[PDB]
């Protein structure tokens, strides 16, 4: 995030880090229950990767993190890599998260909900802070 | 230009698909939504994470970090997967697996 700010630790308890086996972070995602994560289809997650929940500071071990394993990957079959359209993927976890003070779920909307142009919303992540 | 060790957050406004088209034209599809153009931006490494708005008080998944400008320009809006247009697919999938 360019021009954002540090979060209060533990205040976005659905934010997860997706990592390879060496521990390199490549994408984010969101918990929606004890067994399922929502992410983007372009990230190319497979069953080799790890789901890391409950983490704040990637450079320090003053956290109680959960490393979760992926049972299967459901890519949207309308996903088009030329238009980057229908960019959604679901991850079913082979080991359930246990919900706590720093780990739990975001709400999903109804198809019918209306979020009006000009509403203030919020984004989170561990991406570049400058080009 | 490296990664922040600690989790970042930023506030930003939603656009209409009509205004977003003034920057991005025909790349904007029905399963997309834009936010930003307000002095902040998502950037490489944020892909697949959340954009959330309040509904009935609760934080609710409106977008998924998808794509945008190759220099992360804080003048240009960012593009996100529109969860409302994809949520019935989510439901089918959970239900059957």
């Amino acid at each position: 995030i360019v021009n954002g700010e540090e979060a209060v630790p533990g205040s976005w308890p659905w934010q997860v880090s997706l990592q390879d086996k060496t521990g390199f972070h490549f994408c984010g995602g969101s918990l929606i229950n004890e067994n399922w994560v929502v992410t983007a289809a372009h990230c190319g997650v497979t069953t080799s990767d790890v789901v890391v929940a409950g983490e704040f500071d990637q450079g320090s071990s003053s956290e109680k993190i959960q490393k979760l394993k992926i049972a299967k990957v459901f890519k949207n079959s309308k996903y088009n890599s030329l238009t980057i359209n229908n960019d959604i993927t679901l991850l079913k976890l082979s080991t359930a998260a246990s919900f706590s003070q720093t780990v739990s779920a975001v709400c999903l909307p109804s198809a019918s909900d209306d979020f009006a142009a000009g509403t203030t919303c919020v984004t989170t992540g561990w991406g570049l802070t400058r080009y | 230009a490296n990664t922040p060790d600690r989790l970042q957050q930023a506030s930003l406004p939603l656009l209409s698909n009509t205004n977003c088209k003034k920057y991005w034209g025909t790349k904007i599809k029905d399963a997309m939504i834009c936010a930003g153009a307000s002095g902040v931006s998502s950037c490489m490494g944020d892909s697949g994470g959340p954009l959330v708005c309040k509904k009935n008080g609760a934080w609710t998944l409106v977008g998924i970090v998808s794509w945008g400008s190759s220099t992360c320009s804080t003048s240009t809006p960012g593009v996100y997967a529109r969860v409302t247009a994809l949520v019935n697919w989510v439901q089918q999938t959970l239900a059957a697996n």
Binding site: H42, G44 | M44, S47, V65
Partner: peptide
Amino acid sequence: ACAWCLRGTICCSG
């Protein structure tokens, strides 16, 4: 215009 991932061919600057 590119994907905001870190590793891969659709990602900005590879």
